[PDB]
Amino acid sequence: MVKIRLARFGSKHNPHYRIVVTDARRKRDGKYIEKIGYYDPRKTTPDWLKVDVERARYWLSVGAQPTDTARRLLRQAGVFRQE
Amino acid sequence: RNLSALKRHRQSLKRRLRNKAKKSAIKTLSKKAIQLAQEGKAEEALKIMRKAESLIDKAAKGSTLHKNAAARRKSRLMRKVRQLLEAAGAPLIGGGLSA
Amino acid sequence: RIAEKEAGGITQHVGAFEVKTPQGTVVFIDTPGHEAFTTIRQRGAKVADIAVIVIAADDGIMPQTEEAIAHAKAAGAKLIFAINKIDLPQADPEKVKRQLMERGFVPEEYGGDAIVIPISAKTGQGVQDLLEMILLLAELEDYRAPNAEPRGVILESKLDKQAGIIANMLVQEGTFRVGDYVVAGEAYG
Amino acid sequence: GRYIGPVCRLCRREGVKLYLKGERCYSPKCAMERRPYPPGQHGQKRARRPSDYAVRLREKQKLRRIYGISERQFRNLFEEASKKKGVTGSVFLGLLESRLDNVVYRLGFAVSRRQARQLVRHGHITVNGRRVDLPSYRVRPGDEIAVAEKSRNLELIRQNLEAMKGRKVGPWLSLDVEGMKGKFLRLPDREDLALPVNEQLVIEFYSR
RNA sequence: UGGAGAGUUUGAUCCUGGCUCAGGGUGAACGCUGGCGGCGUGCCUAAGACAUGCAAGUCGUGCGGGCCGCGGGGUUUUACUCCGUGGUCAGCGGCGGACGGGUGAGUAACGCGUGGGUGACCUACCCGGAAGAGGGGGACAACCCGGGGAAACUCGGGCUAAUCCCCCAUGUGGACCCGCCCCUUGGGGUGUGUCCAAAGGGCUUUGCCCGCUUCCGGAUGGGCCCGCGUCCCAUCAGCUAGUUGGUGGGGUAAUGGCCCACCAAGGCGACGACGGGUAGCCGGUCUGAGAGGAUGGCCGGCCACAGGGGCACUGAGACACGGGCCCCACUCCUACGGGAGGCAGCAGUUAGGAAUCUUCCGCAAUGGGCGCAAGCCUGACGGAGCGACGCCGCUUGGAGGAAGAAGCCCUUCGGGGUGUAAACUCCUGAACCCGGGACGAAACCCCCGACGAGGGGACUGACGGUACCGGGGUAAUAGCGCCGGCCAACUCCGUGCCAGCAGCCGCGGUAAUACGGAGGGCGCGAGCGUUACCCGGAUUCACUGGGCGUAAAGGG
Ligand SMILES: [Zn+2]
C-alpha cells in the first residue's frame, strides 16, 4: 500500500526526516513518490518542521495511510484539523 | 535448522491438491462437452457446458483460476461449442449460448 | 569418570577432562599424553597442581618416567604413584616399590613421603581409593586454586570446521567470561 | 597542526620583515635588521638567480607563514575563493583574514598571530555570546568578537589593549577598548592591506 | 570564470617524434613515524569452504487441543467438570514470509538508461463509493491408539472445531458466448440466454468496532512491447530450422514462435549479423579549460543469482536468499538401508591474498511485518568498537630573551652556521580530576469530546554519565621525503665504474652541489614518501584540434 512516512537522512546524532509519500515495501531511504515535507527532531532551526498541507490532504484522499509519527507531525502542522 | 514456515508449505500442499481437483475436473468436463458437440447431441451437451462454466466460475471465486483467466477459459469453451453446433444442433435448452 | 567407551591409542586428544568426586571436582590432563618431550622445561608454569606417575608391570620404570618425575618436581607436586596392570600374571608391585625406594621415594607402608596405590586397568579396581587418596593429599598439602587478577595457561592451539582458531585454556586464577579482551604471548583478542 | 618551532628564521628566509612575534619583530631583534640574509651556512653566500616557479613558491610560502596556517587548509581556502566570483586574489585574501585568529590579531587582542590563535583556542575569545576555540572560524561581515567574560581580567589582554590604546585599527574593523569588544565590520579588501605578498604570483603557482 | 610545462636522439640546430616527470585522485596497499576529536568508510582477491549465535514472524479480538497456574464451586478426597482467567506449548486458520539485507559470477541483452505505449493487462493490503452478508452440509490437523524406521521422520484407524472446504438461495453487480449501437485492434453501453457471492468474532451487545463477499473508481506497485543511446576484436563473414511469417489451438493476468500441429520459405547481415573475449547497467564519481576519457566503491534505482543446473507448487506478487522437489558436486552423521546441510544477512572461522573491522549493545528514534490493542518480532536500522583508510578540526605552546652559551658543524682561523632556537623570566592551560548534565521523545496509550477534529494526562534512552557546560589543573608526541636538471633546497667527511642511487637524462674508475653519513636547508606535517591503477600533461587517435614530397604515413 501507499504510506505517508518519514525518511531518515542526515548524519549520526544529527538526524533529519523527510515527511514523504511512498510505497510500504521500500527502503526507508528509497525511491519515494513525493516530498511533501521535512522535520528536524533536534528542533535546531526556527522553521524546524514544515509540510505542504494541500498535497498531504490530496494524498490522504487518494488513500495514503500515514505512519503514526508522521500522522502526529501532520496534526501538529495543521493538516488533519478541519473547520 | 528448523523454522515455523514448514506450516506454509503444508498449507500450500493442501491448497495444491484442492486446486488440482478443481482444475483437472474442469478440464475433463470441457473435454466431455467438446466431445458431445462433435456429433450434434446439443441439449445434453449444452447442459454439460453449463456445468463446466459453473465449475470454472466456482474455481475463479476460490483460489484456483481467479481473475479473468476463468472468463477467458469460458469464452474459449463456449465459442468452440457454438462452432461445433454449426455442424447440426441449434440451442435446444437455451443454456450457455446467447440466444 | 563418566562411563562411555574407549577412544583408542591415538596420540592427540582434545584437552583436560573433569573427574567428579563427593568432596569436589578433580581436573585430569588429556592432551597428547606421552609429550615425546614437547618442552624440556617450560619456564616454571605449574600446569598441573599435582602429578601421578604410572608404572607398568611389564616395562617397569623408564628414563621417560624419571624425566616426568623430574618435571613434576620442578612444577611443585607431592608425587602420587600408580602400579598399572596388576590383574595380569607378570605383575610385580614389590619390585616397583623397591625401585622407587632406590630412586629416593619412600612409600607410607615402609615409612616415608611417597604415596603408592596399585590399579587394575581392565576390570575396575581401586580407582575410588586412588581418588580418595588424591582428595586427602589436596586437603593436606593445601593445593587450592577468583577475585584476583585473572590468569590462565594454553594447553594446545588448533583449527576447526565447526569453529575456527581454537585454544584449549586451563584457568589458574580469576573468572573468565565470554566477551572480554585477552592477550596470550604476542597473540591477543 | 601548526608550523611550531623557530619563527624569525622563516622571515630571514624570505628577506622581508614578516612580524611573526609582534614585539622584537618590531624592535632591532626580528633578525631582519641585525642580519638580513637567509638562514644556515649559505645564507650569507652569493644569492643565485631563482626560477619562475621558485619566486612564486617563495611568495606563497611568505603568505602562508604570515597567516600561520597548514598548507592543506590554505589550498582549500584558495579553492573556495576560486569557486566564488569576483577577484580570486583579493577575495582569497579577505577570506584568509576572516580567520578568527587573524581578526583577533588585527583588533589588538593579542600582539602576535600565533598568540592570537592560542588565545582563541583557550576559550578566551567569544564571538557573539559563545566562546569560540577554533581559529579556522570564518567570520561573515558585521559581526562581534569580544574578550571572554572570564578572560577580561588577565594581564596579557590588558597589556595588548594598552598597546592598541591610542594607535588606530583597520577600516574594516572597530574596537571597544573600554569593554574589550571588537566588531568586524566590512570584509577586508586588498587595498586596505599593504601586505608585502603578491597574490597574482600565488594564484599562478596554484594554477597547474 | 577557464587551458603554465620541462628533461631527453645532436659537436651544436630545427623539427618530427616516442619515453619520462611534475597535477589531482583512489573502496588502495607498503615503509617509517604516530596525540586526539568530528565525520564518512573498510574482502576491489576464490561467486572458495563454512562452525557457533542470531538475521522472519505474528495474531487467543479466527478455532479446537495439551501442560501447567489461580478465583469458586459442583466435587468428602481424588478425579472429572464448568467458566472467568494468567502464561505457555504445538497444531489448524489467516496475513506476512516475493519487503527489507547481500553479492556482481553470469547476462553486450529491451539487461539497463531513456521517451512513450498497453483497445493486450494484473494490483492482496490502502482509500472512495455502491450493494450485500439467507440457510444447510462436510472433511482435516492437533488429539488418542496402532505400527514401520538407528535417526530423519513417517504411514494406518478414529475423533473434533473454525474466518477451512463445499452446496443451495438471492444479483447491486460482474463473467461469457451471440446480436445491436457508439467507438476504433480485445474501449464503452445494452438485450436474450447460462454462470458466480460471502464469515465471523469483539465488547461499554440493541449498539458500535475489526473483519468479510462482489463490483466499479482511484492509488501505488509492476508485467509486457516499441523509438533511440549502450565495450573491444573483420586475424569472427556469412548466420538461422521453431528459424521468419501464417491459420488453428494451447498456455498466460495479457500480446507474442511462449509452446504445439499444419501451410509457406523466409528472416537477419559489412548502417556489422553470427562468433570470441570482455562487462551488471545507470543516477553518478574521478579527471579535464572544455569537448572528451576512465570508472560504476559507498549512497539511490533497476536487473540478475542465491553450491551448480533444472523445474514447478502456493499466492495479489516468486519460478521464491534463511520454502519445495530432483540430479550432480561437496561437507556432516549412519545400526550402510538413509538423511542432514548452504553465511553472495550481521559478526566471526579459515583459505586465497599486499590488503579489509566487533562471534558488540539496543528497539530508544525512523522504517518493516503481524496485531483492535497493548505488544511481539527486527544483525533493516540506530549507535558504539577497531584501522591516520579517506576528508576535515585542534594540540604538540605563547610572550619575552646574546651583536650570540654549550653541543655539534664548517672555516680562508678572523669567523660563520645552527638561532630567539635553547636555557631562563612571565603568561595561558590539551590532557587530567571533580560537579552537573542533555537535544534527539512525542507520540501510539488512557480519559473528556461521537472511537472525528480538538483538550489534558502519563510513561518510554542503546548512544551514555557521552556530547556539552561550571570549577579546578600539567608546558604537555615530531615525523617523513628530498636537496645535479626537471624541482624548492648545499656544504664537508667517507667511499673510488666498488659499495650504491635512479623516474628520466644518467651519476659513481680519488676534491662526487647526484652514493653512505653528518651538519645546513627546503617541502609538507600527524603525517610524508614508495608501489598499483585512472585521468591529466598527450592537439601521442587530434570532433573542438594532427598529419601523409624527404620524418611513421597515399593503396601500383
Ligand atoms: Zn621576526
Side-chain angles (χ1 to χ4, degrees), chain A, chain B, chain C residues 1-4 7-189, chain D:
Chain A
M1 55 142 138
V2 66
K3 288 210 156 171
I4 299 152
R5 40 189 273 236
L6 249 63
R8 162 76 102 95
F9 284 85
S11 181
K12 286 174 195 180
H13 295 261
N14 176 72
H16 273 89
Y17 291 96
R18 274 197 176 60
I19 316 150
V20 97
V21 70
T22 188
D23 174 62
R25 296 147 289 102
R26 272 273 205 271
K27 242 174 216 75
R28 75 114 181 94
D29 205 279
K31 202 186 178 195
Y32 58 86
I33 316 139
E34 210 202 64
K35 178 186 191 166
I36 42 148
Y38 60 93
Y39 155 75
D40 179 63
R42 310 220 276 113
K43 306 154 166 177
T44 349
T45 35
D47 191 42
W48 62 292
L49 105 94
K50 183 260 170 186
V51 67
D52 199 275
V53 290
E54 200 58 50
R55 280 266 86 184
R57 304 171 167 178
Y58 152 83
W59 278 104
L60 282 161
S61 201
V62 321
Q65 187 133 69
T67 327
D68 299 274
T69 322
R71 159 170 269 99
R72 163 202 151 254
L73 279 172
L74 281 155
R75 290 214 309 231
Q76 211 290 314
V79 173
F80 272 81
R81 72 133 43 79
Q82 46 162 303
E83 213 275 297
Chain B
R1 56 179 186 66
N2 198 254
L3 156 58
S4 304
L6 293 150
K7 164 204 165 191
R8 254 284 197 294
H9 178 251
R10 292 179 225 123
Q11 223 171 58
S12 79
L13 266 152
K14 237 165 195 173
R15 255 98 161 268
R16 130 95 177 264
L17 219 288
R18 72 160 101 279
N19 264 67
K20 211 157 189 183
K22 266 194 164 172
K23 203 189 269 188
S24 187
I26 268 157
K27 248 139 183 168
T28 311
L29 239 288
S30 314
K31 277 149 195 169
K32 196 192 171 188
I34 293 169
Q35 285 283 122
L36 272 137
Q38 279 201 116
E39 54 279 342
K41 285 194 177 175
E43 190 256 20
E44 46 267 46
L46 263 28
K47 286 205 237 84
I48 272 129
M49 181 264 233
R50 287 140 90 264
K51 283 151 193 173
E53 184 201 346
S54 178
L55 257 109
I56 289 159
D57 226 323
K58 285 184 177 286
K61 167 80 204 168
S63 49
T64 322
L65 269 160
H66 262 305
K67 307 150 199 291
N68 63 300
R72 186 209 67 239
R73 281 258 197 151
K74 279 167 64 165
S75 87
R76 279 182 152 189
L77 157 126
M78 292 158 91
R79 210 191 294 115
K80 214 171 179 184
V81 163
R82 202 179 200 105
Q83 288 157 47
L84 277 149
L85 288 151
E86 301 300 292
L92 296 184
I93 203 158
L97 305 157
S98 190
Chain C
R1 59 166 287 268
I2 36 93
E4 207 258 305
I10 187 90
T11 50
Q12 268 290 122
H13 304 290
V14 286
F17 287 95
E18 285 178 54
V19 185
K20 310 213 169 291
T21 45
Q23 287 93 295
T25 316
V26 182
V27 180
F28 268 75
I29 291 291
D30 251 287
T31 205
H34 60 99
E35 261 187 52
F37 317 106
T38 307
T39 331
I40 315 148
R41 189 84 80 247
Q42 214 282 314
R43 278 289 93 183
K46 193 166 95 95
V47 182
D49 281 303
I50 320 152
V52 299
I53 301 306
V54 57
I55 295 148
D58 27 293
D59 265 329
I61 309 163
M62 290 290 172
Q64 290 78 32
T65 318
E66 293 182 67
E67 267 152 297
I69 286 154
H71 252 265
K73 285 173 106 172
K78 261 73 194 178
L79 287 148
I80 314 147
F81 299 98
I83 304 149
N84 208 354
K85 283 170 184 177
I86 52 154
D87 80 298
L88 295 165
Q90 61 259 48
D92 213 298
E94 272 290 301
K95 280 176 194 166
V96 167
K97 284 158 195 169
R98 282 194 288 269
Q99 285 181 63
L100 292 157
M101 286 194 284
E102 101 190 305
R103 276 139 180 81
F105 303 99
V106 199
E108 285 181 309
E109 55 210 61
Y110 294 93
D113 58 284
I115 320 289
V116 171
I117 312 101
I119 52 98
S120 182
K122 203 156 194 174
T123 321
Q125 203 177 303
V127 165
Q128 202 68 59
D129 299 292
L130 179 77
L131 288 161
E132 275 194 52
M133 196 63 215
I134 294 158
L135 292 157
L136 284 162
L137 195 89
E139 279 290 311
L140 208 147
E141 294 304 314
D142 210 86
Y143 275 112
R144 300 197 189 106
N147 295 295
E149 209 177 68
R151 201 164 293 267
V153 70
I154 300 289
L155 307 149
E156 58 182 63
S157 55
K158 59 196 204 81
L159 287 155
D160 205 23
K161 281 279 154 192
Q162 286 218 29
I165 281 185
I166 43 168
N168 264 295
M169 189 186 74
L170 180 89
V171 190
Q172 281 195 307
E173 280 167 276
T175 311
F176 284 98
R177 297 159 192 88
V178 165
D180 294 302
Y181 300 113
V182 282
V183 66
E186 288 163 39
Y188 59 87
Chain D
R2 279 303 116 252
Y3 158 77
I4 277 171
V7 118
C8 264
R9 70 156 322 241
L10 309 133
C11 307
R12 290 262 250 76
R13 165 58 62 204
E14 275 79 284
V16 183
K17 206 165 214 192
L18 274 220
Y19 313 95
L20 291 170
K21 285 217 162 182
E23 191 254 59
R24 132 189 284 294
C25 242
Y26 262 116
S27 83
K29 247 149 206 177
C30 184
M32 281 311 302
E33 198 93 60
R34 264 3 187 188
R35 275 133 79 223
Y37 57 91
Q41 275 202 250
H42 316 313
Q44 211 203 118
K45 273 274 173 185
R46 178 92 142 105
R48 33 175 76 272
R49 179 288 201 97
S51 60
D52 281 81
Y53 170 85
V55 184
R56 293 150 174 78
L57 175 272
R58 205 81 252 143
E59 184 73 285
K60 189 208 82 179
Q61 283 289 98
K62 189 190 294 161
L63 200 178
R64 204 195 78 202
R65 265 71 152 275
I66 291 158
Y67 289 159
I69 348 93
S70 62
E71 150 73 24
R72 204 80 151 268
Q73 211 164 121
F74 192 92
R75 190 170 214 103
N76 259 285
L77 209 143
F78 191 94
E79 280 291 319
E80 207 178 296
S82 191
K83 282 193 279 173
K84 280 182 181 182
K85 293 165 194 173
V87 166
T88 310
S90 186
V91 80
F92 167 71
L93 272 131
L95 220 69
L96 259 161
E97 201 78 12
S98 169
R99 276 166 40 74
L100 193 56
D101 54 279
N102 199 338
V103 84
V104 162
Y105 165 75
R106 274 285 180 251
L107 287 162
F109 278 35
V111 92
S112 182
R113 285 200 184 82
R114 42 174 61 271
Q115 180 194 344
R117 119 169 278 93
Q118 192 257 73
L119 256 76
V120 169
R121 221 271 163 289
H122 289 354
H124 300 311
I125 300 303
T126 291
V127 189
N128 293 286
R130 267 113 290 104
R131 51 102 185 247
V132 183
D133 55 63
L134 334 99
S136 187
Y137 187 88
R138 152 166 305 106
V139 193
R140 26 85 177 264
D143 224 62
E144 200 166 64
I145 310 102
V147 172
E149 171 75 56
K150 284 134 193 170
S151 186
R152 277 215 277 273
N153 219 304
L154 273 56
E155 208 159 292
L156 56 166
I157 292 101
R158 258 99 203 271
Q159 280 277 112
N160 296 314
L161 259 335
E162 197 122 57
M164 254 257 181
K165 273 175 192 175
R167 63 189 195 74
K168 279 201 166 182
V169 81
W172 72 102
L173 309 145
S174 182
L175 81 105
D176 197 271
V177 79
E178 287 166 49
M180 299 80 178
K181 298 171 191 177
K183 280 196 181 180
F184 174 79
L185 296 155
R186 163 79 211 112
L187 201 139
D189 210 280
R190 145 87 193 70
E191 234 88 296
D192 296 334
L193 283 96
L195 230 287
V197 76
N198 192 31
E199 67 254 60
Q200 293 177 335
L201 296 161
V202 186
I203 297 155
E204 286 162 59
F205 163 98
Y206 261 96
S207 195
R208 85 183 217 286

